[PDB]
């Protein structure tokens, strides 16, 4: 069936591509590329043209060792982009933020989905998200962006992810967010070494037991970089291969920098799965 | 899991990329590109540097819609000779003709890649005298009429029955079973639905306990989905390669080696993570 927000629907029986729109100076792969409004809008339209059905707007880099972004600065980066896109296009608008104020003002500006790598743990974020009535993506992470890659360790990775998701779904529900408004992301690269990342990719389909949509983000990350020994821009193929492996296991939403390639890949996946 | 020819071993616990070297004027995606001797040699080194562990040489386009024995032999043998005397890599010959098989092996080839599964006059015998590994490919019909209404009651049952028949045929001729490789022949007498059924059910073919070779690179099964020209089919072809290798397919025959190798790395990392 379908995920819904504000009269929009999203077909969960086919892989959907979420296009990354970073509005920061220091995002790990494309910082300073889409920093001004006109450039952001052209990039969004390019991604829409290439077949993305969601645009993920993020004004805070959460790469390992990332700097803090002030509340007002994040607002200034994100909200005018949400507003301008909401007025122009028929598409899901996701906001990659952890701040209560950005959640609320983005909702006010016409956003459809709260993509929070911190699973609504920041002060006021859970209450802010609940009041919007919008779907929320919860992401697994060990540590914070400042220390997550300092020796990641698990007795059993999948058990830990399951426990984390169980705990945070309960927390969202008790706050008044209906379970069917939730998405789960196991958080590739977030407190996970290379082995952990590929273990997780190998076992991804096990997460369907929650009966919630899965969103995954592997695009151009170190889990590809470390294997191919190439810079972020040259990780398109590796990233597409990861997306194909994830989608073959029924991951519903794929978060990527390179929309055209991923969409083409997803066509081949859909034709394979429907056969 | 392990394959040896001429003292050179090929690991099959990890996916292997076979690079395509067409030496024809009319191949469906790259006819005329690598026709002269020097460009054939150039293209091979590039593929080698990109990580190909087999080079596949083919002097006859077998696309939907023939070539003389003297015309075919002159295209392949001089190319086989130079590469064998230059590089430490499995050379494969994409041929059906007995003379081509015999003279190619003499020049130093390692593998017989036959889309007709040794069915031409003298081919089975000529291949036996070499002692080399053979790839047997499934095909319904002939390149002249294979794409005229492909039909199967059950696609997979036919492929299995085709392979069973040609394995026995090879063994009876002296070719040891552990020297055989199977290719279900994507795009060869198969429509769009057939090709993707085959891709979806590919892993079922492991029951023969023989290495699988697959070739989907730039084919119409991708073209019909993406509505892009052959050379713009890299991404679709890589996606097919990933799906095949995740299902344990051991050899992948491709035009775009660098891209496929990078994708196979990700596949290998995933598979060996359990
Ligand atoms: N739900 C979800 N959100 C995410 N947001 C940012 C990044 C990192 O990608 P990018 O935005 O290009 O990096 P940066 O954090 O530097 O902006 N990854 C994910 C992810 O895997 N899942
Ligand atoms: N084993 C095997 N051999 C093959 N040889 C040629 C082609 C067609 O590709 P190409 O050689 O690039 O085209 P052409 O026949 O026009 O030379 N496909 C296969 C295949 O799928 N499997
Ligand atoms: C036209 C046309 C269709 C078509 N199909 S195909 O799948 O691309 C194909 C190409 C080469 C070979 N040897 C077999 C099949 N190729 O050209
Ligand atoms: Mg970002
Ligand atoms: Mg050829």
UniProtKB/TrEMBL annotation, chain B:
CDD domains: DHPS. GO terms for cellular component: cytosol. Its EC number is 2.5.1.15. Its cofactor is Mg(2+). The keyword Ligase does not apply. GO terms for molecular function: dihydropteroate synthase activity; metal ion binding. GO terms for biological process: folic acid biosynthetic process; tetrahydrofolate biosynthetic process. InterPro entries: DHP_synth-like, DHP_synth_dom, DHPS, Dihydropteroate_synth-like_sf, Pterin-binding_dom. It catalyses: (7,8-dihydropterin-6-yl)methyl diphosphate + 4-aminobenzoate = 7,8-dihydropteroate + diphosphate. It holds the Pfam family Pterin_bind. The keyword Endoplasmic reticulum does not apply. It is an enzyme of class 2 (transferase). Coiled coil: none annotated. Belongs to the DHPS family. Homodimer. Catalyzes the condensation of para-aminobenzoate (pABA) with 6-hydroxymethyl-7,8-dihydropterin diphosphate (DHPt-PP) to form 7,8-dihydropteroate (H2Pte), the immediate precursor of folate derivatives. This is Dihydropteroate synthase.
